Design a protein around this ligand. Structure first.
Ligand SMILES: CC(C)S[C@@H]1O[C@H](CO)[C@H](O)[C@H](O)[C@H]1O
Ligand SMILES: CC(C)S[C@@H]1O[C@H](CO)[C@H](O)[C@H](O)[C@H]1O
Ligand SMILES: CC(C)S[C@@H]1O[C@H](CO)[C@H](O)[C@H](O)[C@H]1O
Ligand SMILES: [Mg+2]
Ligand SMILES: [Mg+2]
Ligand SMILES: [Mg+2]
Ligand SMILES: [Mg+2]
Ligand SMILES: [Mg+2]
Ligand code: NA
Ligand code: NA
Ligand code: NA
Ligand code: NA
Ligand code: NA
Ligand code: NA
Ligand code: NA
Ligand code: NA
Lengths: 1011, 204, 193
């Protein structure tokens, strides 16, 4: 039959989809959510054998264990066990596009289990097996007899085993195909793996049972009243004595209950559903659910007899909330949402695509701790627990059908074809049937990157009709089609339009007002966090706050999909596309997270946290204005901490309790803040602290902060005329300057400070030289490849212009002795093939004070691509333990990504000055720095810098972080200027003009001294 | 042009049409019709089938056609004749002046139906004036109303020709047979004969 | 497989639907709507045998005319040939309502035809067969080999026979089932044939 090559067969003998069941036989257990003896797990150790194709599986396997099989843990992805390689491809399908066929060499995993079944389960009732996730298609046998088949790797497939089992020992045999026709609908940009990667369980149901139940909550105008409606369906023999009772509980209290016999109202000329019933319960002043306050009730559905005997009970958590779009705005409980979202794939560096409670909780806590309130299921239904956690911890969720055909040409080739309507339909409908009762799900999504085809319009309509309580969104086909309630573009920029034909990406501000457009706009993906990224983040937040119809977005994305590999010594390292022999592959494009695979944050996470703050502030005089962006809660677990410092030196501080109503303001008058007795800039820093612990945070958690410059007293007190006069010694090849125990050496042939001493200790390993380039960020590279250069990518422009190869030609080097100092003057030209790219003119003034003042004036040819940086670099000889600076910090910060960083005095270990991006590049810059300390050196000025043990040369030539090695000494990059890093996307230039170095003439000055 | 979908004998009528497991089978009965007939100028309206209640499957297919072939309205009478799956109010046997307020799927007087609060579509009966036997009493009543109300745009009489079948007597004389005459049982007897013309096309 | 009792299967190997084609190889003929030498009718005399259920159909039938079959005109309704009774029910289904199953006694019409195909047709191009209407579901064999299956009694089912035919004489075998899961969507008030 080759069912796996036929879109017309998506399953055989599969039971209908429905919400989570447990078949409890005790009401209390249902109410409290305890475990159910009627729901058993089959996860654990199973037998497994790999084959290259389904045709190679021995028939003996159906009846007996293969002696060649191994014992492995289930759930699992077999690539994680090393049976075959996982494949990292982004858009291009991993198999030849020739629907609906797949490769003849189609890796097959034969899983089997021997287990016990108690006669009590067989003597009455129904025993079904549930596979929550099997990728991508499979056949099932039980005791050698064929049971059925299923597709859709991301939703549960359930079969009735009632007639196949025997009391005692039983054996299940599952033949899992890596590729199937379902793979044409599973082209998400992630690792391509396979196996039984979700839970397996057995559920016992009475023959007369609850087969489905749907819970809805509607309200009055101001939400002080609601009605909960629960429709319940049964299977089995109808009897006049059956009843259903639905009761609602707030904690230990039963707030409402209703009971009725089966028999729904009249539907049409033929009557109504004799097998269903709807109970309606009134609820006064319900406690409402939101991500701010995830209040939940418990609904218990009991199927029983009139005389009181329970047959079975099912139940769910209920969140009383209304989701609606009105007048162009997405409202939750009547208030307009501001989505601080993130897209999150299901990814574990060791376990592949298997998800566990611990990792999910870790992700949720980190999200909430970082000010996210929403998550998009990119791009498939998630493991069932996810929703439970969202409901209880409080996150808004976008539940998304497992449908993505990115690699088709054109993209909607399958989605516009009615022959593919059936398969797509089940990916949508089975998702709704499973998740419709979770209150955290507030929006349904038709899938991702599958163009816009008629099948999408049909499925949009189905959802609208079946579940009017949640908007439907879908971005394919230009993000504003007839199959979406929300304009939900991916990577549309704030101000810049990208008028691509047919599917333009307009500036979001502009998009909202196009003629006749009225919907809200929430980006389904934006701020591509690949590598050193998130430049321009604040630009989106500022727009979201100013435009009512700009209601936020989902950052792409949560966590790097890197996988662990081990070297010859068993030491683990993070691997990306191609590292498993997979080819073709998309290299590092699988790593775009705010967090590394092990959940350690990348520096962009703090930028996100700050911009997504729920409190906004203004400073006027001695008054701080705090505005709340919460929609529902008062700031009942917050206090404002304030601190005033002069050039880093604490001067005054305090705390004030915060008492702000949702959307309100509170004015806070700061105490007289006496004048500092010294030159310097006074800075005011505020932070909102949560004194009390919460379910998702520790006492003392900082939720928001902001800084402002207060008075500044310029230094007008001239030197202290001091004593020694430096002395100049000239030779033909150098200029040497001596000052006591310190010496400085300027090579006359190169024109650079080539050496410096403190005592007899040389301080340099490499001369101080200008530097106009950076080890390219992933945003600088984009999709450029050696085998396929993208000439428009910054890195290519740079390379083509000869920036990385340019040679400094000395134009001048003079020495002058002044009264109390020595003055060296140099001028150099960088050229490439005859063209002059940059001109550097400097002065170095050395005084009796031992300070060397450097002045740098650079010219950049208007016609060469704007350079990545304008600074100096050198290799210092020592290695010191700490780095201390007065400037933006403490984490890595770039011009277009520095809002979260605060100006203060920071001191960290050297290692913290390096960001270990898996694909290495320029990293660890701190901007707005007035003073930098390392070892015996001190540099003062107004610059940006990075310091670490890796040269830019090494960063650029090394593709994986585990391969870098500490060089001798310390490499210091000190920049007068540095280009933005971008990130609106990582495939086309994205550094906004205000952050490109295009002024043509630049000036910077630094004093380097030792102390 | 009407899709081959009718599930009249289900209880309730939309049992299969509201069930997603039946969407695929339904969908090909609609899509394959459009693919076959969309170039004929004579087809001016597409219909989702007949007497199959109103299910979510209908809404999905209504939207599919609207999306693929905007040149022709889509109609469907199931579920009360004015559901979201119809561009035309297309009742069957609604009366001119008399309401028949059946629960859930009322059949209002056609003149009253047009003006229900918020209603704006045209009304064309998909079936009316059931010509079973000595019938068509009250036919003129419909015409007078269609001529007087702009939005009453007519209708389709039920139906053209009697579904009688030929059988032969002991004399080999052919005679007109109806339900039950072939030993078929249960059967609906003479209900198969509702035309304006006899099976041989002779007029009634 | 029992495909006729599974609404998940409404066809097997059936070609995509499209508007009326004739494959003219002359523009003037297409312009004038004249007969096309590339569109042939197979209507006329066929061989037919009636069985009470699909399980009673002999395998020999796939490769050889059943001696007991009759020669009958096609297109036709077998009830009109006296093979079994036409049924007149209005609303109530003619079968027990128990989707997606049908009765075990399911009248089966076994039709066949021996016909010729010109060499030119097989030397190049694609040769398909088109059944404009088969009520209610059927499996198709050509020269004893299985080709495909189809449902929906009122739309054409098309199959590519390019790989199954030979120049000269060929034999089609069509096993038509009276009831199928497609009958659940075929409850119109008319004779059930
Ligand atoms: C690389 C682009 C042409 S497609 C781009 O690739 C990204 C890689 O992270 C994401 O998968 C986006 O969803 C996709 O649009
Ligand atoms: C939660 C309910 C009390 S809302 C209640 O519903 C009514 C219809 O039942 C009316 O619409 C009322 O105006 C509305 O407040
Ligand atoms: C007899 C009614 C209850 S149903 C009535 O039967 C008629 C008989 O010709 C037609 O089939 C109509 O379409 C149908 O609605
Ligand atoms: Mg298949
Ligand atoms: Mg994609
Ligand atoms: Mg637990
Ligand atoms: Mg079938
Ligand atoms: Mg009918
Ligand atoms: Na806004
Ligand atoms: Na590649
Ligand atoms: Na990616
Ligand atoms: Na407070
Ligand atoms: Na690199
Ligand atoms: Na009129
Ligand atoms: Na009768
Ligand atoms: Na009739």
């Amino acid at each position: 039959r080759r069912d796996w090559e036929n879109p017309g067969v998506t399953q055989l003998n599969r039971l209908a989809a429905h919400p989570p069941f447990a078949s409890w036989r005790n009401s209390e257990e249902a109410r409290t959510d305890r475990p159910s003896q009627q729901l058993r797990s089959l996860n654990g150790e199973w037998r497994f054998a790999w084959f290259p194709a389904p045709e190679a599986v021995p028939e003996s396997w159906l009846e007996c264990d293969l002696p060649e099989a191994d014992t492995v843990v289930v759930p699992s992805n077999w690539q994680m066990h090393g049976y075959d390689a996982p494949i990292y491809t982004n858009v291009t399908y991993p198999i030849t596009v020739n629907p609906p066929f797949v490769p003849t060499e189609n890796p097959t995993g034969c899983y089997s289990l021997t287990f016990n079944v108690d006669e009590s389960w067989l003597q009455e009732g129904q025993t079904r097996i549930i596979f929550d996730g099997v990728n991508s298609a499979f056949h099932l046998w039980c005791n050698g007899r064929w049971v059925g088949y299923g597709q859709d790797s991301r939703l549960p497939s359930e079969f009735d085993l009632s007639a196949f089992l025997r009391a005692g020992e039983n054996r299940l045999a599952v033949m899992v195909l890596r590729w199937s026709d379902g793979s044409y609908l599973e082209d998400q940009d992630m690792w391509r793996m396979s196996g039984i990667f979700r839970d397996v369980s057995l559920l016992h149901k009475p023959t007369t049972q609850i087969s489905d139940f749907h819970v809805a909550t509607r309200f009055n105008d101001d939400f002080s009243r609601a009605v909960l409606e629960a429709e319940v369906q049964m299977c089995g023999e109808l009897r006049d004595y059956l009843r259903v009772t639905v009761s609602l509980w707030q904690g230990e209290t039963q707030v409402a209950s209703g009971t009725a016999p089966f028999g729904g109202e009249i539907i049409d000329e033929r009557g109504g559903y004799a097998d269903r019933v709807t109970l309606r319960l009134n609820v006064e002043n319900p406690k409402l659910w939101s991500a701010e306050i995830p209040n939940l009730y418990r609904a218990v559905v009991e199927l029983h007899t009139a005389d009181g005997t329970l047959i079975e009970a099912e139940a769910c958590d209920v969140g009383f909330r209304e989701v609606r779009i009105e007048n162009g705005l997405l409202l939750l409980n009547g208030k307009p949402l501001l989505i601080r979202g993130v897209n999150r794939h299901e990814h574990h560096p060791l376990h592949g695509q298997v998800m566990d409670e611990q990792t999910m909780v870790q992700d949720i806590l980190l999200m909430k701790q970082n000010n996210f309130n929403a998550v998009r299921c990119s791009h498939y239904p998630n493991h069932p627990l996810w929703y439970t956690l969202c409901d209880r911890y409080g996150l808004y969720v976008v539940d998304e059908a497992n449908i993505e055909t990115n690699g088709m040409v054109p993209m909607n080739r399958l989605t516009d074809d009615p022959r593919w309507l059936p398969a797509m339909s089940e990916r949508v409908t089975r998702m709704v049937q499973r998740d419709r009762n979770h209150p955290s799900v507030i929006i349904w999504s038709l899938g991702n990157e599958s163009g816009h085809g008629a099948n999408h319009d049909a499925l949009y309509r189905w959802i609208k009709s079946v579940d009017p309580s949640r908007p439907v969104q879908y971005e394919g086909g230009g993000a504003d089609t007839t199959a979406t309630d929300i304009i939900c573009p991916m990577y549309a920029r704030v101000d810049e339009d990208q008028p691509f034909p047919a599917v333009p990406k307009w500036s979001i501000k502009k998009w909202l007002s196009l003629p006749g457009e009225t919907r809200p706009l929430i980006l389904c993906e934006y701020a591509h966090a690949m590598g050193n990224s998130l430049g321009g983040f604040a630009k989106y937040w500022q727009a979201f706050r100013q435009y009512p119809r700009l209601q936020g977005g989902f950052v792409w994305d949560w966590v790097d999909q890197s996988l662990i590999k081990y070297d010859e010594n068993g030491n683990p390292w993070s691997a990306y596309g191609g590292d498993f022999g997979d080819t073709p592959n998309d290299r590092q494009f699988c790593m775009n997270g705010l967090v590394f695979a092990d959940r350690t944050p990348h520096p962009a996470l703090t930028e996100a946290k700050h911009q997504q703050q729920f409190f906004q502030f203004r400073l006027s005089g001695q008054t701080i204005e705090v505005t709340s962006e919460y929609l529902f809660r008062h700031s009942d677990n917050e206090l404002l901490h304030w601190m005033v410092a002069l050039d880093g030196k604490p001067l005054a501080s305090g705390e004030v309790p915060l008492d702000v109503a949702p959307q309100g303001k509170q004015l806070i008058e700061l105490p007289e803040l006496p004048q500092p007795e010294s030159a310097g800039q006074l800075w005011l820093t505020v932070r909102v602290v949560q004194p009390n612990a919460t379910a998702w945070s520790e006492a003392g958690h900082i939720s928001a902060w902001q800084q402002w410059r207060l008075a500044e007293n310029l230094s007008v007190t001239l030197p202290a005329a001091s004593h020694a006069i430096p002395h100049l010694t000239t030779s033909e090849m150098d200029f040497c300057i001596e000052l006591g125990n310190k010496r400085w050496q300027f090579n006359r042939q190169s024109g650079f400070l080539s050496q410096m001493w403190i005592g007899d200790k040389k301080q340099l390993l490499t001369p101080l030289r200008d530097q106009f380039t950076r080890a390219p960020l992933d945003n600088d590279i984009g999709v450029s490849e050696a085998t396929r250069i993208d000439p428009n990518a910054w890195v290519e422009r740079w390379k083509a212009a000869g920036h990385y190869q340019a040679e400094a030609a000395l134009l001048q080097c003079t020495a002058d002795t002044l009264a109390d100092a020595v003055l060296i003057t140099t001028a150099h030209a960088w050229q490439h093939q005859g063209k002059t790219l940059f001109i550097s003119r400097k002065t170095y003034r050395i005084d009796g004070s031992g300070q060397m003042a450097i002045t740098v004036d650079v010219e950049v040819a208007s016609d060469t691509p704007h350079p990545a940086r304008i600074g100096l670099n050198c290799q210092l000889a020592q290695v010191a333990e700490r780095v201390n600076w007065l400037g933006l910090g403490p984490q890595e910060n770039y011009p277009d990504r520095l809002t979260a960083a605060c100006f203060d005095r920071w001191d960290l270990p050297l290692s913290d000055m390096y960001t270990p991006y898996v694909f290495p590049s320029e990293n660890g810059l701190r901007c707005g720095t007035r003073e930098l300390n390392y070892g015996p050196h001190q540099w003062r000025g107004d610059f940006q810098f990075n310091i670490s043990r890796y040269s830019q040369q090494q960063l650029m030539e090394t593709s994986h972080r585990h391969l870098l090695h500490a060089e001798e000494g310390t490499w210091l990059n000190i920049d007068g200027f540095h280009m933005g890093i971008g990130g609106d996307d990582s495939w086309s230039p994205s550094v906004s003009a205000e952050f490109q170095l295009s002024a043509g003439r630049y000036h910077y000055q630094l004093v380097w001294c030792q102390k």
